[PDB]
Amino acid sequence: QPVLHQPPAMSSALGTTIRLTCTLRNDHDIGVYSVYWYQQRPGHPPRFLLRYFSQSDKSQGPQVPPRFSGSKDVARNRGYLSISELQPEDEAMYYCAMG
């Protein structure tokens, strides 16, 4: 029931496109928050991937490829992180955050 929800695990084959989901509890409006996404590999610091509020208000992280991109489904209170051209290095933990 807590504030943000993320499936514990997702998997896909090389070269494909996947979309990770971040769901915000229905007692809050995602339409008022920007969604933040971070990537983290074993024994490494969290790495800011991108921040997305809307199509005219978003920003890419330092040296983070365009194949990484966010969006939203405000009706469903969902935050999205899409990664296409999936590569091995993409294997890692991904965290979303609101604000």
Binding site: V3, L4, H5, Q6, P7, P8, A9, M10, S11, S12, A13, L14, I18, L20, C22, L24, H28, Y33, Q40, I83, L86, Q87, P88, D90, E91, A92, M93, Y94, Y95, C96, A97, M98, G99
Partner: protein, 112 residues
């Protein structure tokens, strides 16, 4: 909600066939029970992707390590339950329920 993080999603880029965990549930040994102690261990190995949840149950009712990499590049994990010899012998059974990639494998043992 500001600055609050989600539990995170582990993404694995498939590099080998998916494999459901092999599960073995070990009951307390005879000598450990002679030392007035009882411990059950749930061993899970050869699974991929390396993410799963474990749940212990006592006669049907639920009770309230992190995956690591094997030589054969598949993953393994273990969990244990501390009980008194009385609790062990007084319940019809205990179980280790392992959920992996949406499937569930559960093993049970009785106080024999």
């Amino acid at each position: 909600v500001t600055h609050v993080f989600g539990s995170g999603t582990q993404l694995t880029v498939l590099s080998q066939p998916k494999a459901t965990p092999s599960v073995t549930l070990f009951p307390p040994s005879s000598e450990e029970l002679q030392a007035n102690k009882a411990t059950l261990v749930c061993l899970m190995n050869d699974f991929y992707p390396g993410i799963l949840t474990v749940t212990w149950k006592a006669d049907g009712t639920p009770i309230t390590t992190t995956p690591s990499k094997q030589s054969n590049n598949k993953y393994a994990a273990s969990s244990y339950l501390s009980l008194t010899p009385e609790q062990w012998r007084s319940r019809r059974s205990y179980s280790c329920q392992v959920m992996h990639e949406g499937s569930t494998v559960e093993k049970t043992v009785a106080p024999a």
